[PDB]
Known about the structure:
This is part of a larger assembly, with five copies of chain A, one copy of chain F and two copies of chain G.
Chain A: H1 2-27, H2 32-50
Helix pairs in contact in A: 1-2
Chain F: H1 12-38, H2 45-69, E1 70-72, H3 74-77, H4 80-91, E2 97-99, E3 105-107, H5 108-129, H6 133-138, E4 147-154, E5 157-163, H7 172-180, H8 191-194, H9 219-229, E6 233-235, E7 245-250, E8 255-262, E9 267-271, E10 277-279, E11 286-289, E12 293-298, E13 301-307, H10 308-312, E14 325-330, E15 335-340, E16 342-350, E17 364-369, E18 375-379, H11 381-390
Parallel strand pairs in F: 2-4, 9-18, 13-15
Antiparallel strand pairs in F: 1-3, 4-5, 5-7, 6-7, 8-9, 8-16, 10-14, 11-12, 12-13, 14-15, 17-18
Chain G: E1 3-9, E2 14-18, E3 24-27, E4 32-33, E5 43-47, E6 50-56, H1 57-60, E7 73-76, E8 85-88, E9 90-97, E10 102-103, E11 119-121, E12 129-130, H2 133-137
Parallel strand pairs in G: 2-12, 6-8
Antiparallel strand pairs in G: 1-2, 1-9, 3-7, 4-5, 5-6, 7-8, 10-11, 11-12
PDB class: membrane protein
Keywords: Chemotaxis, Signal Transduction, Membrane Protein
Entry title: Chemotaxis core signalling unit from E protein lysed E. coli cells
Amino acid sequence: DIISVIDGIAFQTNILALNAAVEAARAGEQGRGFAVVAGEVRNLAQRSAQA
Amino acid sequence: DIISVIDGIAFQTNILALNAAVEAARAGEQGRGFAVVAGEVRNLAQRSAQA
Amino acid sequence: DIISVIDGIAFQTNILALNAAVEAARAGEQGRGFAVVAGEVRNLAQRSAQA
Amino acid sequence: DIISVIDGIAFQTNILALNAAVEAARAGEQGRGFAVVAGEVRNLAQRSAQA
Amino acid sequence: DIISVIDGIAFQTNILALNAAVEAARAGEQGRGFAVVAGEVRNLAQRSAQA
Amino acid sequence: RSNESTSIRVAVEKVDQLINLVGELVITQSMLAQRSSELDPVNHGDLITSMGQLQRNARDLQESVMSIRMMPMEYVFSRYPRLVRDLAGKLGKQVELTLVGSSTELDKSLIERIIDPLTHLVRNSLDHGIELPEKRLAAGKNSVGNLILSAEHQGGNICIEVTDDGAGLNRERILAKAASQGLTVSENMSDDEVAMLIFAPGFSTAEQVTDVSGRGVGMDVVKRNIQKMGGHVEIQSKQGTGTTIRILLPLTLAILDGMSVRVADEVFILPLNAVMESLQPREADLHPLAGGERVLEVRGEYLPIVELWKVFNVAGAKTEATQGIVVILQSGGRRYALLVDQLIGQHQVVVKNLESNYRKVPGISAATILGDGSVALIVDVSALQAINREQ
Amino acid sequence: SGQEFLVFTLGDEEYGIDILKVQEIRGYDQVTRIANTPAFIKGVTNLRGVIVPIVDLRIKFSQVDVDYNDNTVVIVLNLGQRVVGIVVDGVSDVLSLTAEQIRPAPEFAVTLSTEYLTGLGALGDRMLILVNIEKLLNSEEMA
Amino acid sequence: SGQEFLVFTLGDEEYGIDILKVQEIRGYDQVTRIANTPAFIKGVTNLRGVIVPIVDLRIKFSQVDVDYNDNTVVIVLNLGQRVVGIVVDGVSDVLSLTAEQIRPAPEFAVTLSTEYLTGLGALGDRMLILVNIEKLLNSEEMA
């Protein structure tokens, strides 16, 4: 039951983490910092989800 | 062993979201798009970590 | 005797946690960063003292 | 169980206070006041965690 | 044998982390953040090396 | 009507005495400030705090005494029209002098030694540089010249440039004259670099200096006076374009910014203006070199690695670069590395000439003293630049 | 870096759009079915007090099968003049295509999708079908 | 936006002051008694080489029950003409009172006078008494 919740929480994290890169694209090179963080955070969400 | 990895991945996600949240609300009114996303991702990281 | 020290230090932490938020709000836009961090740190002091 | 919670709460306080010191560093001389409070809060976190 | 390797790797980490602080102060106001960050990273290397 | 004021006659000797009093004051607080940092912060808790407020006020009063001793640059620029508007009509030319940045100031002692150097540059432009009106219109250039004497401040320095739109400094003529006297030259040097080779003994804008120019003053003598004042000189000219000569002048020559490096017990100091970067090279960026030496790869370019312990013969030093630290230096355009054991940080020490009781030694330029009391030797970057060339 | 895009998968093929126009990504929420509209337009939803008509791109191209499980998500757009929603099977990731990677559109008798095909992100082996989100929803088939 | 104020505790009652007039906050420190002065003034303490007198607001209001603890806090101020601090038993919480929350002073008898009070800060079930520390420390009695 908890794994089913972690899978859901991990799935939602990919949604919010995905939007982080969208908002960072508006800033351009200035928002490149959040792009790297959003890229890694989005990857960790998949690793935690697949795990 | 996997839970130990998910625990670390879930914990690191909270650290990355924390730095992004602090940088978002660091200064300027335009730090709303990054503060909201960073706040939600940080909350899900704790829920996934405690889970 | 140790809990009495932790309880006292927990109370002092709440005072110092709010002192940063006081000077933070007084700085204006440049202090919004410390206000967010000081706000969460203050909550931990209450839970630490309540515990 | 409560000591284990206070240990975690005291640990999270160090992470939050750690980001505050890093923020004041990037700001330069415009964050010396918060660095003293941030460093002091970190010291109390170690005492609470050590205690 | 591993402790001897950790001591060697930790030694380089302290020297490498030290160069970051020197290069950070060389830029002046454009490296105040890396000064405390690099100054703290090298501190952890000394504790890890000493430990 | 904004605001008015008045002034009173003050002897120059009295104003000069202030520089001596504040001079030792700035030098005294600098030595004491270093001791408070090395010692524990307990007893020096509030002392270090008050030192910060005094460190800034100490320089504010110093710069104030100097500013009161300086004079507007317009007073110096008011003498050039006498040589431009007059010599132009005598030789049969049309030259209009333009002044930029008249609000700039300059020390009185520096005005009593920079007029003739600059006066010689303007005299050469009105003879060899600028041509006749007919020759200018033939090449599409305007008939009337345009001599510009710019000037502006620069933090703790003063910048003065002498831009000209004359015929320009010839390139092939400088290489032939510089190579004859035994000066290293090459075709790779751009037009701006060859212009810096007119400082040879007895030579200026033209080969005939003593014959044309009455006063025995040229680029070789001009640079000599600049060294006595502690300034620099730069030239950015090109054939068929113009000519520009920049001259800098310092304001305070008693503190030198440089990092304190340690090499087994003994401690040394390296100037900060010459230090570029620093890191810990590993096995993935170290190659051998002819003569039992090594080179450091920095973004493809393999710079020469100079061991600091070999020059001073320091026993027990970190001969291996993987254990010690390597800092990238520079002196005269070319860069070069330097091996050391451990670094300390940036510290503004006070220069102390060693010639007061002995003489200069190879590899050292000056010295100082730390907070404890030990003497710190300031390594010379100019000497190390010549060691790698022999390797 | 070059122009950024937002590539999303619709089962098998891939399509890229201007990430700057994308507002926020959400899930497959409830919608109001409107029989007056065609088949490729499911319904509308209320987002921030604005009627955001949802669109099913998977049905416009006439694919094999269309699913509506939890894997399906929605991407809120922002055309300035209106806010339209599009249904997607799943987003891939955010990339940054350069001038050399973006290839020109093909040629054929009928215009077909060329009305909005801004380019083809030929990222080595992975093929990207860059489609202009503005001209897509504002084309004759969608208008 | 509403006017910001710094709230603090003094045993049982609660008061507030303008945040702009406040400079910093720091724990209690040793002071120096002045020759012939009121009882509500503890003394003067050094601060960055400046004489900053220390006044106890709890004793100034003339209360019945007075207490002392090691957790005392002193709020440093920065008035337009002087730099005098104030002692408080413990800070409360920074607020942003609006035009409706700032009510006039009561009509009955209170500790201070009408001129030494800016208003009343309403915040749920916690009535705050706004004190005009500016003119209070710079009044005729303090000069």
